[model samples]
Target: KKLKVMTVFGTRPEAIKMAPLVLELKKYPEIDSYVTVTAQHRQMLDQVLDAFHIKPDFDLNIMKERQTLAEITSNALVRLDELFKDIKPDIVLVHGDTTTTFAGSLAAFYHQIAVGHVEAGLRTGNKYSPFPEELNRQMTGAIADLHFAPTGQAKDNLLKENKKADSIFVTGNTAIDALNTTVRDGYSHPVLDQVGEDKMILLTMENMFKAIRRIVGEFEDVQVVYPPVVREAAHKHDSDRVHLIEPLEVIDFHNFAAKSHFILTDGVQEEAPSLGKPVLVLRDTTEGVEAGTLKLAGTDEENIYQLAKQLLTDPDEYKKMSQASNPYGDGEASRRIVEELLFHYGYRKEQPDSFT
Candidate 1:
């Protein structure tokens, strides 16, 4: 009997990390892999899918303009529950630290289906520093039947919390797997041409509208590229310096980051480090500790501006951060995960080796 496995995720981060695993899952003759996306972020999610050449088997299409976190969670739960009933998957796979991750796990639990969490067992001790992402990963860990941890530390964290040692597998981070495919030589973007010889700052905002508004026009010879919504919020500061572009496709964004001076964002914290771009996290904290190059510049405008200014002006600071080695993993995470799934389903008796 073929095992029917469903991979579920939403948002750009989840999609990027999960896409490699989904491709790996499809290669198994004994397994039927299906993808379902809640699309918590419509434009961003679609961008990743297109970049990876993945066509989702199910798209919940639940994104709305300025949808509250509670609303995203509820909508994902309701829609995924219905999809679960219809699909009747043998195992449902969800990625890390998003409302969709926890909500999808809850729905799978309610239906008595096994839930496998990818990039699991991450923690920051303080639940609110990452602002709900920390809590989301914890909740998903609780409901997960199998945990694919990214590092030994992550696996140890799960063990400390009393998650069954047998249930945890230390698979390397899939973000590295994604980078192996996305970043390449001679990658080009039209925006990169427009910002000739100027330091480009790639910024993604979640709830830092106030901070963004304060930083506009504060720096000369710096070009800031952001989404349209953020442009609207900081409309008064809009000028030739502030470049408002549509949400970038994943490959475009990856190329852009590779060419940028540094990145400022709430998402893609782990991803930036892999591209050798120094990251300025807008949040007070982050769960991606492997992003050693990340500097937490809180939502306070003055703090963010000062930290960003340093990276722009201080060559040593930028070089140190850009040269920092990524603590995550090499690029074999998806292969290990697929081997484990085969073992778990009785198709293979030998367990896969852990990422060290």
Candidate 2:
């Protein structure tokens, strides 16, 4: 009998990365792959599925106008609970620590189904989100049957937490793994070529936009192809150098990611190191800092400008960060997770590795 592996996710990044892994599971004849999508944010959620040749086997979708933290979980949890019982899966795989993921991982444990938590081993010691602060974030680790941490940074967290070591697998990250099928060399789009040789620096997050604009003058023809933007956010973009765009086709968006001059946002870290793209994380998370591919750019407008200039002017510095190998993902992250399942379930005995 084949093991049932039910993969649940919501959001654009999770879909881009995790959905591909769902496809990966299908390749293993011993596993029956099932995908459930709760379009947590319907707009950003549905669009990406079209990019991949996938349709959610079940849709817990179809919307609220920014529902509160408690709102989404209650809905997602109940629906998944019934599904977990209906199918009785071997494991439920969830990506990241979002409310949706927390619910999926939690519900899996509710039915005593094995739950796998992928991504974010970095303990975010701070809490900025209102209302449900602590349990909303930390509870998953205790519930996660396996922690597929992307880096040693994550594995050290569980090890430091007194959790048993074997349960954690640093199988790298599928965030970057999804890129293998997305951006082929034959892809070409007219609008995207706007990047135009002059060092295409991709910027989409806040604070860094203004800070980066100032440094544009300090550097050479560094074109910022910021494709993902909003209307109100567009009004503040007075600087002409920043090209504000409204989303893109999958191949168009992914090809841009591959050719990225630099990454200053999340998910774009999708193979940033592997693709030789240096990243400036706009937040306080140092997940890839020790890996040398990304540095903590933080929430300061001033430091953002300063850091932006250094990478441009210092060729040696940029060259160093731009080398191949994403510390989190080796493109084989998905393959490893499948192997972890195989190894853990006693399907295969040959095992040799450590995420720590």
Candidate 3:
């Protein structure tokens, strides 16, 4: 018998990380797949879907100007309630924490259907640290029948929260799995062309003033680009010295990482580390410690500047950063997820292996 799986997500980050698993699900004839998008990022989300050629079975079209969190959640809940009733999936799978993720899980619970959380059990414990994200994952964890925690740390978090040990599966981070699936030797992009063979590229954020200033202070030849800002107000800090541009498509960003001298950025720095490139992360804390390749620059301007300066001046320092072991995983996370779902539904008789 075929297992019916419904995968739902709404944001760009959620979509990019979930894309590999969604595609993998389609490859198995034993699985009947359904895709639903919340359109939280509308245009940006569609660009990724286009890159992956993913045509969702349902697009909720939930994007609105200045939409409040409550509004997005309320709207998604109402819409997903209808989708669950219509699709009648044997299992509803939700990715990471977002308003859409929580709403979809709530809808599934409303219908008494089982739910599996992808990249589950991520926590800051401080509750408001990641703002709504921490809370969203916690709430999702409370209701999840199958918790596909992405790392040992994440699984530990679930256990600490009193989540059932049996319910949690350490599947490693899907972003690392995505690196294996996407970035290829022959992949090409305009950014790569502009980067050429001679120059080392680095992507950074304007707010990582410390890290960016530090890197810029030392390296004159390397090219630096700031990622897209969340609002037009962010450009207030911009100057002609630092280049500003549109965000890279997932493949472009992945491919760009393949060519970087090394990537330096603020918070949520994942790709460069996965690609074996040194990533100087400008954040107070990184949840993915398996990303040992990422050097935390804290938020101190002087410290960040000195770190970037030293890396530029010291070849050994640069080499060590890149050589740090990737504690994330081998690229079999999607397969682990599939096996876990099958085990949960009794379609597969054996318990699945954990990513740890």
Candidate 4:
């Protein structure tokens, strides 16, 4: 019997990275592939699905404005129960550290189906700081039968948890796979149109936004670009220097990052290094600081402002970060992920090469 596999995800980042893997699953006639989106993020998730041409077999459409995590999780678990009974999937694949990731994995576990966690084994260690994300990935790791860790470091994390060594595969991050598709040279944007000869710093932030405006005011040659801010409050810092733009499509954001000097509040720690952009992870802790592509800028506003200032002024320091090799992925994570799934089930016996 063919392996019955269903990949479940909900957020934009999850959609972008998983889209490549979903396509890879379809290429093999030996496996039956199904796509399920919880639509934890509706509009953003659909844009990526459109970009990758993926139509989900099941859409929970679970988004409710002002919905609590408790509500989303409960609804997803209940909805997934009926679907799993219908589909009878052998394995359920969940991505990253979203509410749907944990819920999907738990639902699969309840049905005695296996879970393969893609982009697994990220840990800030401080669970409460990243909020639900840290707990979500941690919980999913416990339920997953296979962990598709994106880096050697990620593999090490899984091993520390006493996960079976054979079950964790270092399949370079699929973010790079999606990156290869979206980021391109000569990519033009209206922001890029106005960025003549100026250094562009791409940011994703709040209190940091305040510091960003201070730095933008100080650094005349540097430009800061951020998206989809809180409007009334975020525009407090808006100027020619701080260009607060509308929400970007996945393609647009990837291309924007590709053309950037460095990126700064980053899950982007996983993807930005692929573009050789030095990154300041604006948090107290990071899972991938050992990978060296990202440096921690403390949560304090002064510290963030100071770090941005130093990066702008100190070329040598910036060079050190920009020059670090991307430990995340090699643009073929989707192939490795699919290969390992087959190998795990003995459909393909030979070992698939890992990211390391």
Candidate 5:
């Protein structure tokens, strides 16, 4: 019999990363796949599904105007409970640390179904820094049976907390897997054409007031593009060189990240490493760390300026950083995850191989 597996997520980033997994699960003859969305950001969530040409088997339709985190969690749990009861999946998969991720995991646990957490065990040690995400993943860790940790460090964090080592798999980040689905060769856009003959640099951040001022104050030659969220915020920033271009969708972001000279980030620049782009994270700490793939600098104005300058003028350091192979994955995470589910469901006799 085919094993019934369900995947649940909400928010834009969660949708992009989870799409590949949902699509891959459909490939297996012994796996019955289902997709569900909590609609955390109603329109944006739908846009991602539309971009990927993915249709959710179930939409929880949990979005509400001026809803608090508590409300979203409550709605996801209440709605997902009914979906699980109806589908009766052998295992439930939740992506990232969104309210929907935690709620879906909880609903699965209540139903006594196995919960597999994608992008599991990421931690910053500082709970309040992430404003509930750190706690969300930790709490979900308690309810999950399989930990699909994205990095070795993430897997170690789970082990330190007494999670059974055998149950943990250090799969590469699914964000990396998403590169395969999103990035395309010969893809064209006005931005790419307009950016022609110039080194495109992607600068993205939520709290970049100081960093933006510094970049504008110093760097003048680089052509910078902003994501949609950043573009909206850029209106407040005044600079001629800092043209606030429109945001790139996931596929465009991946393609641009690959073609850009390098990425100037503040820890939230989408999938930096997966694109093999040298990233200078304008922050002292980051959840994702892998040797030289990412460079962590203080978010202070001086540090951000100096780091960006180094990448621009220092050819040796720039080459070394940009050529660093991504420690994230080999674009086979979805397959591994499906194989693990197969193992647990008695379709496969052995455990799936760990990426690292």
Candidate 6:
């Protein structure tokens, strides 16, 4: 009998991690996999799905202009309740600690269906570690039947909580699998041809508002490209050096980051340093600090300009930053995860190796 598996997630980070597993699930004739996205992040979530060429079986489309946490959870639970009644999946898989993850599991439990929690058992020991996430993961853990913990530490966390040792399997993370599929050798873009012979500064997010003019004036010899909003700002100064372009697709962005000299942004960050490019953060604070050189350039134009110039002019600084290790992935997480799932379902003879 085919095991009907419904995989649920909402945000981009969840999409990135879960995408590989979705692909893996399709290979097994014994499992009928269905994808359901709450689309809490809407555009960003769609970008990731599109990049992976994943067409969801169901889309909740619950995003509002600025929906509160309560609204998100309430909407997800209600809508997923309907999905559960219709799909009646053998196992409903929820990833990480998004409200969608917690609500999806709850809906499944309410329907008396089995729940599998992917990337489970992460804890920060405080109820408000990041406000709702720590609590959300814990709540989901309490209800889940099978736990796919990414590391031994994660498994240990579940064990310490007295979660059944046999129920937890360390399958590694699927984000590394995403990196393996997305980034490629000898990739090319039209933008790369235009950025020839000059250093490219890739800026993301809105904090570059005031710094654009000064950055253009001081660094006329360098090249700059960014999303439409920043492109409009760059257009007012120098179109010749500052190229205004539409926002890139995920694949294109990764390719661009790999081709660029370095990156500067105020947004929540990723991928540039993964491509060995140094990043100059244009904000006062960051969530987590990575080992590779990340500099805080504040919001001031002069500060940003000076920091950018240092990267362009100082080969030593650039070298140090570029060589800083990518702390994220090792490219084999998906295979391990797929093997773990197969073993869990008694399809494989043995469990897969964990990603240390």
Q: Rate the local accuracy (lDDT) of all candidates.
A: 0.81, 0.73, 0.76, 0.83, 0.77, 0.76
Q: Which portions of model 4 miss their true places by more than 4 Å? A: 63-70, 124-131, 186-188, 205-220, 228-239, 283-292, 296-317
TM per prediction: 0.74, 0.82, 0.86, 0.83, 0.87, 0.75
Per-residue lDDT of 53-103 in model 1, one digit per residue for the tens?
888899887764588888888888899899998999999999988887898
- Could you report the Cα RMSD, in angstroms, for every candidate shown? 5.0, 3.8, 3.6, 3.5, 3.4, 4.4
Off by over 4 Å in 6: 40-50, 59-71, 121-131, 146-173, 183-193, 205-221, 228-239, 244-252, 267-270, 282-290, 293-307, 314-317
Q: Rank the candidates by TM-score, best first.
A: 5, 3, 4, 2, 6, 1
By summed lDDT, the worst window of 10 consecutive residues in model 5 runs over 205-214
Off by over 4 Å in 5: 40-42, 205-221, 228-242, 267-270, 287-290, 299-303
Off-target runs (Cα >4 Å) in candidate 2 are 40-43, 62-66, 127-134, 205-220, 228-241, 247-253, 264-270, 281-287, 295-310
| Per-residue alpha-carbon lDDT of candidate 3 for residues 193-307, written as tens digits (9 for 90 to 100) | 5546644646654436545644554555655655544564244434433455677666677777777777766623655676678877777765534435777776666776777
Clashes of 3: 1
Clashes of 6: 0
Task: Tell me which of candidates 2 and 4 scores higher on TM-score.
Answer: 4
Name the top TM-score candidate.
5
The worst-scoring run of ten residues by lDDT in candidate 1 lies at: 205-214
Q: Which stretches of candidate 3 lie over 4 Å from their true place?
A: 186-191, 205-221, 228-244, 284-291, 298-302
Worst 10 residues of 4 by lDDT: 229-238
Q: Distance (Å) between predicted and true CA of 276, model 1? A: 2.0
Off by over 4 Å in 1: 40-44, 61-75, 124-135, 184-188, 197-250, 264-266, 280-292, 295-319
lDDT of 5 by residue, 210-318 (tens): 5655665566666666668545576546665454667676667777787787877652343767566788776565643556778877756567767777887889988
lDDT of 3: 0.76
